């Protein structure tokens, strides 16, 4: 159910207006706290001595109504960046007064307009207000998609019309930078009569958009007179509905022969006819842009309620079963089916899902198998013992050890193990598998047979703000930027297509094994945008054509086990069209720990993040 409100400038009486607006079906009302035309003076002597109340008292509504139903709008006559000293001084005083009154009321949100090239003084006043007191109101910067000077008609003889398509965004960015990416400043994207190129909308959708303002003049007239959005505004509204922005319908009823509610109703219709969420999206709901630390099973034991979520995925284990089936068919010919017994070793059996998959694969392939299930977490070993005693029986042998420290009784025909993370090697799968190789038969195979990790630059002020919010005390203040986070990228914009890095193959039988890696990636850029970090995905080949992947263009259908990973950078890197982002990644180890270092070089050389694993390491 889409949450939408109403924007008004004439409010003769608050109670009646709220009643009517609620009756029409809106959720909240955006109004001016002070009368828009009631200019006020603070310096001039005769004028500033104005008696009587400045604005309607706050007792008019209950304390709850202000906190949920009202959104304050700054007076239009205020212009902090005026070029006249008296006007600017009065504007500063009035804006501070209005912000203070809004905070006093308890307003959930306050609207401020960005309809000028320069907003430095306004930003200064807003920043001063944000750092004073103990208020919590959010601030929505009403900024249009197309600057007013560009959408005006060409009816002036002395001045004909016409990077110019992006100027509005530059107004936002600068303002944001002046406020230092405050968590309390959001964007109220004011949609226009016509949309810009797809790239502009893509860049905008990466911004922290909280509300979208729809004028009543956008809607077209259908065959029966009801309002209807254009065919491209429809797609844009769908894209916004992918986010959870609130729609504010502004203007007057351009369709007098119909009730205003129609404008709302149509929106609701688009909300109800939105394409249904898929299984993956439904699974991921509630964790969009929710930073999480990766799992490091090699050093820290998992809990049962993590294996529970690991088991919900049906795609992963079906693919593993198919891979085992194909491998068993390939290795054992039909004539040798009777006596050829293949040895399978599951490494990291967990609570026995992969053991069940292997047994099922052998059963359907008609090939006999012996099974060794290795596991280190003793808690999972208890479950494996119960499974073995009750149901698997003699066919499965459970071992409680680390495969790097285990001494197998016989060599393995097939090795099966999933030890991958968001990044393919994030979970130290290569380190464990290389050690495990010592008990792998000469012609045996390993599943997965190979895995690669792909990296792609991203832009997301939301994620940058979360990373900054991960400021924990008793550690380096910059440490939060020097560690990866596994998170479902939702409010982000992809600057370029992912590229491969750090490929791994098993079994690796080169003369001297080395797991340290170094990769340099160059990403073209198509729009002036700010890079905030790099998102990492992984792809993997289990056996021949059987594969798993979370890369956006080849995502496995419905496989929701893994989320992308995020490597942030300390300072946003501004990049212009035609430039190339040159990032460099190092996977380093010292036989006791493993870490990742990353540095940007081409646009503007950045510092080497996480040197010598000072801020993030995986125990080995």
């Amino acid at each position: 159910r889409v949450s939408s409100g109403r924007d008004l400038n004439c409010v003769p009486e608050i109670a009646d207006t709220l009643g009517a607006v609620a009756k029409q079906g809106f959720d909240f009302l955006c109004m001016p706290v002070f009368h828009p035309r009631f200019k006020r003076e603070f310096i001039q002597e005769p004028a500033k001595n104005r008696p009587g109340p400045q604005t309607r008292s706050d007792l008019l509504l209950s304390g709850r109504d202000w906190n949920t139903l009202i959104v304050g709008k700054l007076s239009p006559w205020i212009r902090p960046d005026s070029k006249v000293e008296k006007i600017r001084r009065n504007s500063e005083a009035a804006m501070l007064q209005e912000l203070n009154f809004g905070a006093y009321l308890g307003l959930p949100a306050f609207l401020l307009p960005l309809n000028q090239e320069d907003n430095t003084n306004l930003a200064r006043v807003l920043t001063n207000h944000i750092h004073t007191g103990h208020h919590s109101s959010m601030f929505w910067m009403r900024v249009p998609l197309v600057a007013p000077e560009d959408l005006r008609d060409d009816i002036i003889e002395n001045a004909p019309t016409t990077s110019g398509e992006e100027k509005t965004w530059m107004w936002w960015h600068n303002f944001r930078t002046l406020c230092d990416y405050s968590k309390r400043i959001a964007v109220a994207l004011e949609i226009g009569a016509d949309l810009p190129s797809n790239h502009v909308i893509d860049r905008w959708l990466g911004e922290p958009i909280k509300a979208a303002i729809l004028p009543t003049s956008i809607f077209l007239t259908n065959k029966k007179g009801f309002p209807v959005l254009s065919k491209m505004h429809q797609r844009l509204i769908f894209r916004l509905l992918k986010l959870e922005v609130q729609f504010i319908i502004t203007g007057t009823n351009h369709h007098s022969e119909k009730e205003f509610c129609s404008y709302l109703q149509y929106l609701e219709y688009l909300s109800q006819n939105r394409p249904p969420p898929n299984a993956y999206e439904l699974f991921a709901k509630g964790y969009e842009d929710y930073l999480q630390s990766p799992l490091q099973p090699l050093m820290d034991n998992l809990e049962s309620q993590t294996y529970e979520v690991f088991e919900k995925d049906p795609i992963k284990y079906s693919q593993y079963q198919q891979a085992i089936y194909k491998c068993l068919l390939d290795r054992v010919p039909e004539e040798e089916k009777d006596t050829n017994v293949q040895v399978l070793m599951v490494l990291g059996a967990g609570r026995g899902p992969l053991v069940n998959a292997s047994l099922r694969a052998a059963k359907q392939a008609d090939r006999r198998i012996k099974l060794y299930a290795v596991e280190k977490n003793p808690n999972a070993v208890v479950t494996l013992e119960n499974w073995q005693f009750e149901e698997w029986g003699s066919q499965v042998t459970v071992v409680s050890s680390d495969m790097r420290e285990w001494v197998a009784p016989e060599k393995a025909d097939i090795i099966v193990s999933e030890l991958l993370g968001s990044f393919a090697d994030n979970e130290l799968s290569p380190e464990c598998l290389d050690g495990a190789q010592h008990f792998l038969k000469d012609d045996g195979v390993s599943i997965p047979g190979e895995y690669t990790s792909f990296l792609a630059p991203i832009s997301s002020s939301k994620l940058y703000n979360e990373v900054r919010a991960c400021r924990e005390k008793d550690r380096d203040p910059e440490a939060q930027f020097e560690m990866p986070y596994v998170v479902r990228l939702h409010n982000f914009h992809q600057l370029s297509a992912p590229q491969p890095c750090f490929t791994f193959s098993h079994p690796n039988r080169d003369p001297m094994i080395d797991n340290n890696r170094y990769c340099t990636l160059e990403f073209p850029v198509e729009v002036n945008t700010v890079l905030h970090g790099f998102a990492g995905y992984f792809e993997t080949v289990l056996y021949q054509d059987i594969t798993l992947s979370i890369r956006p263009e080849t995502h496995s259908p419905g496989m929701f086990s893994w989320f992308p990973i995020l490597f942030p950078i300390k300072q946003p890197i501004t990049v212009r069209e035609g430039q190339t982002i040159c990032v460099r990644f190092w996977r380093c180890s010292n036989s006791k720990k493993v870490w990742y270092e990353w540095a940007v070089t081409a646009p503007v050389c950045s510092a080497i993040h996480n040197p010598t694993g000072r801020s993030y390491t995986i125990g080995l």
Binding site: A284, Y287, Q292, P294, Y485
Partner: peptide, 6 residues
């Protein structure tokens, strides 16, 4: 932590 995080 559902997904691949804590």
């Amino acid at each position: 932590g559902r997904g691949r995080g804590r």
